[PDB]
Amino acid sequence: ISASIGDIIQRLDVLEQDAQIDRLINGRLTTLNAFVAQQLVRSESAALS
Amino acid sequence: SSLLGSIAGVGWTAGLSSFAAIPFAQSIFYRLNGVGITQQVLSENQKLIANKFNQALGAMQTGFTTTNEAFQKVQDAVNNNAQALSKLASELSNTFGAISASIGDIIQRLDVLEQDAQIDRLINGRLTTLNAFVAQQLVRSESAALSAQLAKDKVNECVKAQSKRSGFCGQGTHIVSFVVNAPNGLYFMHVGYYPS
Amino acid sequence: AQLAKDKVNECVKAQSKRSGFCGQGTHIVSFVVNAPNGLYFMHVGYYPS
Amino acid sequence: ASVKSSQSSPIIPGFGGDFNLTLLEPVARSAIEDLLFDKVT
Amino acid sequence: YVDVGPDSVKSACIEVDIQQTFFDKTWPRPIDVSKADGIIYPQGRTYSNITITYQGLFPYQGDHGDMYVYSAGHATGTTPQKLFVANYSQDVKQFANGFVVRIGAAANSTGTVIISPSTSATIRKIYPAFMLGSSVGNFSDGKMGRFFNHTLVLLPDGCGTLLRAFYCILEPRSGNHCPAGNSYTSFATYHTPATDCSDGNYNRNASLNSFKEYFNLRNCTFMYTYNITEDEILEWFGITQTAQGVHLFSSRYVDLYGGNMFQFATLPVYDTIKYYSIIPHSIRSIQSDRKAWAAFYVYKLQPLTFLLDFSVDGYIRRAIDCGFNDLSQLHCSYESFDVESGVYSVSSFEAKPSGSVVEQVECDFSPLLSGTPPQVYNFKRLVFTNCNYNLTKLLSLFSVNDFTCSQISPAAIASNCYSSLILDYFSYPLSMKSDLSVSSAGPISQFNYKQSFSNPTCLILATVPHNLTTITKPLKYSYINKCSRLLSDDRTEVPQLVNANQYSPCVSIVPSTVWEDGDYYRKQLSPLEGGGWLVASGSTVAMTEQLQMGFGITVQYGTDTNSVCPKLKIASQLGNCVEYSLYGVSGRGVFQNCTAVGVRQQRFVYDAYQNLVGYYSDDGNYYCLRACVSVPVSVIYDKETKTHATLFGSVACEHISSTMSQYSRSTRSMLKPVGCVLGLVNSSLFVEDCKLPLGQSLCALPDTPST
Amino acid sequence: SDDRTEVPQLVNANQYSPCVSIVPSTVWEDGDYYRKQLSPLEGGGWLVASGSTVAMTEQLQMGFGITVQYGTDTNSVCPKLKIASQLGNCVEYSLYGVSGRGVFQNCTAVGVRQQRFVYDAYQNLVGYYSDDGNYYCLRAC
Amino acid sequence: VTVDCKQYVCNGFQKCEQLLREYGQFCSKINQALHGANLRQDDSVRNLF
Amino acid sequence: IADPGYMQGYDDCMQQICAQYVAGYKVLPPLMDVNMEAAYT
């Protein structure tokens, strides 16, 4: 459930709110870490070129 | 060290490699006669150059730390693979998983039925991140083989021959270049000209 | 593949007065045959001995 | 194997006269190599 | 309960003179974490020469805290008279996460006697006293500062040679100047040095006795004492609370000369401390014996991540408050008292919501209250578009027995605005609560009533009182316990499961109320319908005294959306910055009168994602929205000369303000204008050409040397 | 203080309910309700509670809640029953709330010494304490 | 490009910021990694020209 | 290129890519002004 904050108020109870939000942080930060690995790749290939 | 032996005679050339034994001084008067194309009357009158060559190598002795990358590249390499190995292996263990005291509920907490559940979380995660480490070792291994083939291209060009080409043989009409083994890699002491 | 183009334009057309790349010895001829997925070289070098 | 192949001088304490070369082995891991192995942590 | 010694036998209290202006001084002693001011050592484990970033309770860098001072009382040449105090007893503070205290810092220096400002004296350390508890209010004469029920009191005694900690009910006494008596101003404690602090015979109960004059101590669960060696050394005291109880910290026993605080007690106080006050002390000296007493300073704790630098011997002698500014962040966000010299990007600075636009009357719950709630399998559906709802109104009629939601909370479902509300109601027994669940495979979800899993949902169990009389009860509660098809082969049975937002296929053959528990229904199918049979079986539960009902709510959460908000100039135009709150969706935007792209009969416009760019709703114009304003700040650290310099990303020399108050995060607690070649910088000066070039080599072309 | 908005006061771990001030130690009758107007400082509005009862049983029935913390430090808390002590100068140990396998040595001298472990920037303990009183610094397997 | 994590995740909401504080190591390694990437790239620009 | 903003493009997009509006991500400037890369070449 990803309306940019997981059940911030509205959409879920605060105690679970942490459950859906922690899904969104583990996922969103993990994919951000994939972006960082990608920047290291194109940075190294950019330095080769 | 046999490469430093072959610097003088192999740097002549006239072919790589079927030669020679020429003293190092005359090797730098021909290497210097070549691309810094000052012919014989300047190197005759005068030398000392020798004291300027030795002065250059002297500042090459004093300066390693810290503002002299290449050297920060060297510790970027040792801190690279030491960081990846030890520090990534410190992230891999202790801790990753949901309940992750090395062994979940090790010998001390519940539950014997759910023990396989939390442990299988820790194995799927810990082995998956280990597999990320293996993908990383394949990456830096392949790039290390690219750079090693570059080093072979820098030894066969810049170290044996002169090499009448710009940087690679860094910054100036190149004259001599020396090879020493650094941590994980080679290390070059390219002796170039600088007009000024 | 850009390396192979650099090995065809240097080692195959010309001689190429350079060490390995044109493997192990003062290079003389080099031949190209298509291998699976790649080229394949039959660098004919000198070996003093 | 694409480094050595042929043929050293060999290593005598006088390389070039007079080019003071630190790259001599003192005796086995020469002096500049000793600097960039000691200063690296 | 514990014997804490006899009540006071005095029939009056000592008169107290409150003169706050004599205690209003500026003697700043702000937190400097560089020197490890205000640091509690970590509880979980302890460490050697290691540095680290660590999240725990700390005071913030530069916090001046709250200063308190105790004074000599009034006196003649021979006789102590009225006490002399500040207004501290009426100043009740929120405990929150607790606090740390700098004690005795000015000891040995020369300072004023307070009650006689023209008189100076050598400053001596004095210990603070605190009153803490869970419930506060006013004394009988209306003055603030009364603590109710069990109260924790921390009271030094014996001329600064012990701390007493006790937890009692404080019964205010009724004599003159006492808190339940006439002529009450403030309570206080005191001691009388001429008689209480004579060599070799300190009165270890002097302050306690003075306290007992203002309050009787009742039902004390504990009274502990902690001995203190007499000296004039600076020290730190701390207090927190954890379920175990209230934890006391001091530098005295483990780091007397360095100031690190370590735990020395856990008090069995399990009622959460919410409030505290500083108990004023006045020293009943005679005029010729007047001393100056060191101010003490209280700093609130909060969870912060610090860089902690541990010496070889394990103590912390240097810390960094990472959130103090971008320079410290860089300093930290690296786990390193030293951050190599360069440009380091610290986050925004997002603007503050102002002009919260709300767009939408009164939702019609009528037909629910009039008649007989049908059976669960014949649930009635109320739809809500474009109206205001008082739902806590509706749920105040009934007695409510259970409230669970999925992908939302009951708190949240009252507050938020939604495009497409749906209220489903029916008769339903409380006995069958375990079958009315979003996570249930009973007959109710199988054959009777199923909510959507794609929208947020709530499920309410209630009881109509007696007070509600327009709601009639039926003969009994009924539900379907089997709905299946028998195929045309006469012996394949296929359960007919109910789909969300639909009725059971068996409602055509199951009566609106089941006549008897276990009755079964059948209906042969036409070859077109598939052949074979349709079959069902009904269950009953006995009717209750008061009728019991079930409510299912589904919010959108769409999709098609908007116009269903709760109910309660500014919530309209022209809120030309953040924030809005449309019925359809939340969000933070900068509306502008743009042109002209949309649908124009349903209200929004998206751009290929979830976002809305963005007009509608206003009546009727094009208020196209945008994303939030963020100032993309950075830090130009330069560790050689230790001079940070905050650079903003690309805006603006004109739009910023120094220590900008329209924006959220420095980051975070505290901040600290020349451009404009790149962006705006909080660093002088203008070019200044041209050198050299080298690092630390900022952006487009400021090459920025130092200093 | 708007006389409309109801906000449940949820209990936090290892605290009492904010309503224990108004709910008797035993509820007199099932469904009784309690109220208390709040001072403007307390927030205004009201505090409200309602009590439930269950009939007493033949034999009294009780509830026990236990919470353990693995050390870390103090005061220590093990079951009861030269060995299980020094000099086990190799694997294994089993200290207070902490397990592990180590090679203790009489090392020097870095720690806190008041609470009784020492970590090195991770979960591990490197490692002295607990012995009485010396520095048995531990290592990995 | 550098991401300003601890405010990318999350959008700036305090509960979500605390749930980031649980992951305060990972964000530091993100922005540490990108700042390293930009110094390597910037030294490629500088050393190039 | 829909980018860049250097004290005219932030405000210019504010008058209305979002390296300066999500924040979030953020694009740094390329170490050299265009007149100076033009000076090198």
Author numbering:
A (entry chain C): 1047 to 1095
B (entry chain B): 949 to 1144
C (entry chain A): 1096 to 1144
D (entry chain B): 851 to 877, 886 to 899
E (entry chain B): 18 to 377, 381 to 588, 595 to 698, 710 to 744
F (entry chain A): 508 to 588, 595 to 654
G (entry chain C): 802 to 850
H (entry chain C): 900 to 915, 924 to 948
Question: Could you give the paper's own sentences about this structure?
Answer:
The key determinant of host specificity is the envelope-located trimeric spike (S) glycoprotein, which can be further cleaved by host proteases into an N-terminal S1 subunit and a membrane-bound C-terminal S2 region. In the S1 subunit, the receptor binding domain (RBD, also called the C terminal domain, CTD) is localized in the C-terminal region, spanning ∼200 amino acids, and structural studies have revealed that the RBD consists of two subdomains: the core and external subdomains. For both MERS-CoV and SARS-CoV S proteins, the S2 subunit is mainly composed of α-helices and forms the stem region of the S protein. Here we present high-resolution structures of the trimeric MERS-CoV and SARS-CoV S proteins in its pre-fusion conformation by single particle cryo-electron microscopy (cryo-EM).
For the MERS-CoV S protein, we also mutated the S2 cleavage site to enhance the stability. The cleaved form of the MERS-CoV S ectodomain was confirmed by SDS–polyacrylamide gel electrophoresis (SDS–PAGE), and further N-terminal sequencing revealed that the S ectodomain protein was cleaved after residue R748, three residues ahead of the S2 cleavage site. Strikingly, for both trimers we observed two different classes of particles during three-dimensional classification, representing two conformations of the trimeric S protein with RBDs in different states (standing or lying). The MERS-CoV S1/S2 trimers could be classified into two classes with one (40% of particles) or two (60% of particles) RBDs in the standing state, and we cannot detect other conformations with all three RBDs in the standing or lying state. In the MERS-CoV or SARS-CoV S trimers, compared with the rest of the maps, the RBD region in the standing state features weaker and poorer density and has lower local resolution, which likely correlates with the flexibility for receptor binding in vivo. However, our unprecedented observation of an inherently flexible RBD in both the MERS-CoV and SARS-CoV S trimers provides a plausible explanation for the receptor binding process for the two CoVs, as the receptor binding surface can be fully exposed in the standing state. We hypothesis that on the cell surface one CD26 may crosslink two S trimers by binding to standing RBDs, one from each trimer, whereas the monomeric ACE2 receptor will bind to the SARS-CoV S trimer in the pattern of one receptor to one S trimer.
